[PDB]
C-alpha cells in the first residue's frame, strides 16, 4: 500500500497526518515542580496524538501490533523533541514547547540537569535554521525516526523498504529545490546526521525524566510511566 506511493503522494500523506500544536496550562506568575509539571503534562497529551499520527505514517499499520508498540516505546521522546526543535526554529535562543510556553536557556535552569538538555535542543534548532529546514523535510525526518530508531522476521525488510521510500522522497524534494546531485546527497547526509544527536538528546532526556520520577519531584501520568519503563533505566 505504501510501496505504490509517489514522492509527492508521500509528502502529502505525511503533511496531512501532522499532529496539532497543543497548548500548555501555563499561567504567567513568577519553580522546578511547576516547570516539570507543565512539560510532562504536555507530553502526555501529545503522546495520544502521536499514536494516531503514527498510524497515518505510510507502512506503519502494516506492521504487527507488537512491533508498533516497540517502535513508539523507543522513539516517542525523539519524536517529541524533533517536534519541539521544529516549532522553535523561528525563535532563536528559545524553545517553543507550546505557543503559550516559550522558554529560554535561563528558565531551563529552574530545573536541575535541564539546562544541559535545553542547550542541546537549542543548538539543534539553530542547526535547522542554518540549513533552512523545510516542513516537507521535517515530516520525512520525523517518520524516519519512528521507523528507524527501534528496528535494530520479514518485518524488518518491510520497514527498510518504507525507509528507502522516504529516502527517495527526500531526494525528490531536494531535486525540486534546484539542488545539484552533489548537493542532494550532502544535504541528505546532513539531515540524517542530526538524527544521531536527537537520539543523544532523547537518551539524556530519558535519564533526566527517570531522575525526576525517582526524586518524586512532579508526578507522571500512567502513559508516561509505561513509555519510561520501556527503556529500563
Amino acid at each position: 500500500l505504501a510501496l505504490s506511493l509517489t514522492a509527492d503522494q508521500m509528502v502529502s500523506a505525511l503533511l496531512d497526518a501532522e499532529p496539532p500544536i497543543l497548548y500548555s496550562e501555563y499561567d504567567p506568575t513568577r519553580s522546578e515542580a511547576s516547570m516539570m509539571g507543565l512539560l510532562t503534562n504536555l507530553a502526555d497529551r501529545e503522546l495520544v496524538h502521536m499514536i494516531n499520527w503514527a498510524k497515518r505514517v505510510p507502512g506503519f499499520v502494516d506492521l504487527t501490533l507488537h512491533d508498533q508498540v516497540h517502535l513508539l516505546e523507543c522513539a516517542w521522546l525523539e519524536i517529541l523533541m524533533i517536534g519541539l526543535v521544529w516549532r522553535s526554529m523561528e525563535h532563536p535562543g528559545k524553545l517553543l514547547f507550546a505557543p503559550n510556553l516559550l522558554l529560554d536557556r535561563n528558565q531551563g535552569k529552574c530545573v536541575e540537569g535541564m539546562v544541559e538538555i535545553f542547550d542541546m535542543l537549542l543548538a539543534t534548532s539553530s542547526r535547522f535554521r542554518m540549513m533552512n529546514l523545510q516542513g516537507e523535510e521535517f515530516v520525512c525526518l520525523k517518520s524516519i525516526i519512528l521507523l528507524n530508531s527501534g528496528v535494530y522476521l520479514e518485518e524488518k525488510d518491510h520497514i527498510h523498504r518504507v525507509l528507502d521510500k522516504i529516502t527517495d522522497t527526500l531526494i525528490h524534494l531536494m531535486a525540486k529545490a534546484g539542488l545539484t546531485l552533489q548537493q542532494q546527497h550532502q544535504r541528505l547526509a546532513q539531515l540524517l546526521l542530526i538524527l544521531s544527536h536527537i537520539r543523544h538528546m532523547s537518551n539524556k532526556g530519558m535519564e533526566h525524566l527517570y531522575s525526576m520520577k525517582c526524586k518524586n519531584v512532579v508526578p507522571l501520568s500512567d502513559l508516561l510511566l509505561e513509555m519510561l519503563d520501556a527503556h529500563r533505566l
Binding site: I51, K55, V69
Partner: peptide
C-alpha cells in the same frame, strides 16, 4: 499497556 490499547482503538 496503555500504548497497546491506544493503538488498538
Amino acid at each position: 499497556k496503555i500504548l497497546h490499547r491506544l493503538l488498538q482503538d
